[PDB]
């Protein structure tokens, strides 16, 4: 569209979509329920064909950190590969796992850890 990059509201909405991307515990496979929202994310990304995005994988702090790193990276890669197969230019996308390194809430209860478990898709 007429905007090179998504505005702040659009960026927020993008991550609201991305937080609904769910994985089974200890797994990095895209579940089918994520298909629709990923297809919608593809729709949004296609409106900004020259903007670049970092797909981020985040876990809660439970379990060993090194395993969380690998898992979060592999979930981010799974999301990127899906987006690429869905028509997004590969050169536009980076994928990076952060493990438990970037919490947005406390890891001391279920509510906070649920917030910490997320995929983000951030404008670069």
Q: What one-character-per-residue DSSP string does 21-51 give?
A: ----TT--PPPTHHHHHHHHHHHHHTTSTT-
d(CA 118, CA 59): 7
Q: Using an 8 Å Cβ cutoff, are 11 and 122 in contact?
A: yes
**Is the Cα torsion angle 99, 103, 106, 109 positive or negative in sign?**
negative
The two tokens of residue 91 are 């050169």
- What sign has the CA pseudo-torsion 112, 39, 55, 98? positive
**Distance (Å, whole) CA 43 – CA 46:** 5
Cα(1)–Cα(45) distance, integer angstroms? 11
Domain that holds residue 106: 1-124
DSSP secondary structure letters along the chain: ---SS--HHHHHHHHHHHTT----TT--PPPTHHHHHHHHHHHHHTTSTT--EEEEEE--S-S-HHHHHHHHHHHHHHHHHHHHHTT--GGGEEEEEEETSS-SS-SSSHHHHHHHSEEEEEE-
- 8 A C-beta contact, residue 87 and residue 7: no
Query: Can you give the CATH number for the domain in which 14 is found?
Result: 3.30.1330.60
**Residue from 67, 72, 58 nearest 105 by CA:** 58
Resolution, given in Å to one decimal, reads 2.2
- Into how many domains does the chain fold? 1
- Residues contacting residue 96 through CB under 8 Å, at least 6 positions apart: 54, 55, 56, 57, 73, 76
Q: Which of 104, 94, 20 is nearest to 61 (CA)?
A: 104
Give dist(CA 113, CA 101) in Å, integer: 13
């Amino acid at each position: 569209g007429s905007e090179f990059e998504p505005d702040e509201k659009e960026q927020k909405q993008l991550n609201q979509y991305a937080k609904t991307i769910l994985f089974d515990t200890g797994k990095a496979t895209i579940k089918f329920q994520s298909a629709e929202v990923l297809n919608q994310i593809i729709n949004v990304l296609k409106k900004y064909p020259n903007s670049r995005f970092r797909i981020e994988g985040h876990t809660d702090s439970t379990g060993k950190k090194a395993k969380n790193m690998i898992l979060s990276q592999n979930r981010a890669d799974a999301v990127k590969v899906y987006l690429i197969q869905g028509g997004i230019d590969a050169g536009r996308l980076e994928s990076q796992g952060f493990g438990p390194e970037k919490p947005i809430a406390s890891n001391k209860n279920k509510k906070g850890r649920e917030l910490n478990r997320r995929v983000e898709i951030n404008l670069i």
